[PDB]
Every structure is written in C-alpha cells, then in structure tokens.
Amino acid sequence: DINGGGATLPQKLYLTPDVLTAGFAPYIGVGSGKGKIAFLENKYNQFGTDTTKNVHWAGSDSKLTATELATYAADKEPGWGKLIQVPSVATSVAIPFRKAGANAVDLSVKELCGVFSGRIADWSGITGAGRSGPIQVVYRAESSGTTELFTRFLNAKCTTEPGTFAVTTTFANSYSLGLTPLAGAVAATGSDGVMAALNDTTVAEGRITYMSPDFAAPTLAGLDDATKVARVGKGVVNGVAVEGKSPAAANVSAAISVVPLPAAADRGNPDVWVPVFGATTGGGVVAYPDSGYPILGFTNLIFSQCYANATQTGQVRDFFTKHYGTSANNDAAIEANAFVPLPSNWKAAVRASFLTASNALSIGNTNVCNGKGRPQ
C-alpha cells in the first residue's frame, strides 16, 4: 500500500471513500509538521508505530522551507528523485466560537486582530455582536498548516496592534509580545482537539479559534450560522457600511480563480507551486482579496516524482489523473467537505508537469526515474 498522512485540515476529505484511489492506505491525520517530517525523512513513526512501513506522500498546509527543500535535494533526490509539492484544494480559514446570542457575530479585520493579539479581551468589544464577557482563545499546540495559513493573514493585515504577528506553524510563537497578553489561552492538538476544546460544555462560554472549514461546523449550512461561526470583513467601503462574509467556500472561490499560475520557467522548483497570500500583489505573492471572505489559502500534496515500485507509480499517476482531471475528478467531494476546487488552468498546469509522460517532471518518467525512486 501507498502510505500518506499529515495535515488535519483536509483529513476528512482524504478519508472520504474514493477520493484517494486504488492502492492508497487510509490517510493518517497528524498535523502538517509531522507530515513534512514523515515524507522528507521517510519516518513513518510520525504516523504510527509500524515503522517497517515507508512513507509515500504527505498532506501539508505548511509550505516546504528552504532548508527542507535543500536537505531533500542533497540527501534524498539522487536516489529517490525530485519531490513534488502541489496545491490540492483551496480553503478558507473559519472562526468558530462558543458564545450565545441572537445577533450575528461579524468581525472587522481590526477586531479579529485584537481578539488574537489579546487587545480585545471581552466580547463587548465586538461591535454589533450583542455579547459580553471574557473571550478565551484556543489555538493549535503543535506545528500546524492551519496556523501557517492563519498567521500569514495576521502578518499581512494586523498592522496596528502593539506587536506584530510572524508567519509560523506554531501559534504560540507568532505574536511578537508572546501569548502573555492573552488570559488563559488554551492549546490543543489537531483540528479535532481544538474543536473538542471549543465545544467543551464543562467550561464557561467564550471560546474562539481559527479552523478548517470542514471542522468548523457539523455541516456546510452551519458555516453560515453567524451565532456560531463568525463572519469576517465588517467595515466601511466607499462611505457605506458593509457586512463581512461567512467562510463558506462560495465566498473565497472568486479570489482563488484568479491566482496566477506558477512561473513556467521555474516549475522545476517546488516552492513556486504553492501560492501564498500577502498584503500586496508582487514578486509571486498574491494580495489577500478585498472582496468576499478575506482569510484563505491552499492546502497541498507532497509526492515523489519516482517510486521504486512500478505498480505504486501507476497508482500515484491514477490518483493525479483523478484529483487534477478535467472530468471524473474529486471536485464534488472537495465541495462537499467545505473546500474550493482548483481552477481549471491550475489542474491543467499540474497535469502538464507531473502527468504528461514527455515532461521531464512527470511522475514515473522512464528517463528520469531509471533506476531510482522511493522505497515501496
């Protein structure tokens, strides 16, 4: 079997029957940090105790770092082939909370920033929410791609707090002044662990967090309940008050559709395949959108170009053919789990590099993978 795991943000998608195709073992959700280690170092111990198994792929919503890429290129690539890093689906980052009230909770970006910096410690500081009492932040204890996607937004947009947020996979390391300004912030492990803490009725109401939209509510409809999942984007544009949007996929799809393709000449560099958002467009960075739901990003796949086993090679190719297909694809399942399919031009680009047999980057390319590949 082909073994993968990593990011919890999309784990329920990858666990849905037939999203992963023949040969793929059930996906093991353990966090993006562990997913990257598992793949880069071939350490199945990050997935489970049966370390006779080899790792074949990972899900991650944390980008591979310069050091990770360079180390793999030097240590593993000569014998195993190039790694491949590609977007899987696009996603919002939802803000679920436990605080009763008939009023819609609609955070301005400034309010969001204050909640997560500690500047706003009481629900009464959220205009229009009709709520009062302490806010308690729940965050991911471990190295998390959800944290990376969220802190990338805070870094770009929270520009008038006392401190600043660094982009990181460890939330406790993000704010320059630390977590100390927050009173009783709670760390939990996994998307599921954070939601369990958020939903814990043995403690007082008031908790809030950042979350995969597939976990942030029991069903898609729940993402539109602003008494449980915050709208984000409240403000004033051209002199007129505007409401924020829910993190429903429909509210980020327009922004995703116009994300530029990875620069053609550099498509041999895995770093260019994962777009990141930022304050302004330029140098490969895509500006966070001024319309729709504001907090978005990509979750990604990490594979090898080459596998020692020919059956596994074909099975990986069959998965790419489905996941990036023009038709007979995973898009209905992607949408059903609160995510945004990749645009057609993105699917085509992924296929043209990693599937089309003649391409030097293609999975199982006979000239490149001659005598090479990750162990079965």
From Swiss-Prot:
Gene3D superfamilies: Periplasmic binding protein-like II (3.40.190.10). Disulfide bonds join 113-158, 306-369. GO terms for biological process: phosphate ion transport. Found in human plasma. Keywords: Disulfide bond, Phosphate transport, Secreted, Transport. Heterooligomer with human PON1. Phosphate-binding protein. This is Phosphate-binding protein. It comes from Unknown prokaryotic organism.
